[PDB]
């Protein structure tokens with residue numbers, strides 16, 4: 001009955017602490033003011049968007065790899081190996097209908113994460129780790145990111 | 161479990177039909193790529209954002225008046241008079257923290273409409289009329305709109 005909107009500007013390489021955590025029912029949307037589908041190779045990730053728990057766990061890791069022409073979704077506890085990674089083939093195909101900008105949305109359905117690029121749902125991710133999101137990061141491979149140097153993030157919390 | 165994201169480009173003077181209706185629990189966000197808090201007088205509204213029913217009723221009317229330095233929230237059935245209008249004083253005060261752009265968010269709480277400008281909740285509107293929103297309009301007074309000529313709209317439906 002009293003939802004909230006929080007806006008963040010995330011510079012590449014940075015991690016921001018959410019003024020309000022993202023839990024079941026809440027939403028996170030990343031806005032990119034540019035799209036470079038022919039930027040270069042990632043080491044191996046050109047661009048990575050992360051949702052992190054209060055103790056460093058990678059609730060959700062989203063990685064775009066041009067050289068491999070794929071998108072990877074994984075998770076992992078702090079100082080622990082990477083877990084079972086789901087992948088979606090064809091990067092450009094997902095950004096069809098972009099036009100110099102893109103938005104990635106993540107719905108926290110509680111027991112899963114729905115990832116949408118623009119208007120297309122790309123995957124229904126099954127949570128390998130549970131918990132509320134308290135911080136988000138935008139990591140890039142030097143000079144080869146498919147997104148703008150600064151990505152805007154909007155969270156809609158306190159829905160359910 | 162299968163929420164949806166729809167993007168719309170709304171030119172001043174137009175109405176768009178939502179590919180997906182907005183009902184209780186859903187969200188609508190308007191994005192303006194400009195802010196003119198010194199554009200001029202509205203006749204009387206400099207800019208109006210409307211949420212309309214499949215019947216033409218104005219579920220929610222949001223109007224910004226610079227000459228009257230106020231924001232009006234009303235509703236009305238088709239070919240009927242305007243109802244009880246709620247008002248918020250001080251236009252600029254609501255956009256504090258903007259900086260060349262703004263976003264207005266409307267949460268459909270079922271029996272109310274929470275309106276947020278950027279991160280500030282401006283009013284918890286009590287629905288004078290109920291129903292699902294099926295179309296949206298952006299009206300303005302020639303040359304005196306406080307928003308860009310084109311406003312982007314993003315709806316998040318199928319939440320509840």
Ligand SMILES: OC[C@H]1O[C@@H](O[C@H]2[C@H](O)[C@@H](O)[C@H](O)O[C@@H]2CO)[C@H](O)[C@@H](O)[C@H]1O
Pocket residue numbers: 044045061063072073074075082083085
């Ligand atoms: O799980 C995402 C994670 O992948 C790492 O690379 C993996 C690679 O994708 C996989 O095919 C191989 O078997 O193991 C590599 C190392 O775990 C990236 O290095 C890391 O940054 C994440 O993107």
Ligand SMILES: OC[C@H]1O[C@@H](O[C@H]2[C@H](O)[C@@H](O)[C@H](O)O[C@@H]2CO)[C@H](O)[C@@H](O)[C@H]1O
Pocket residue numbers: 204205221223232233234235242243245
């Ligand atoms: O209710 C919104 C509606 O207001 C109309 O103007 C009002 C005016 O603000 C009020 O002071 C007067 O008593 O009644 C008018 C309605 O006849 C606008 O003309 C209309 O466009 C809406 O903005």
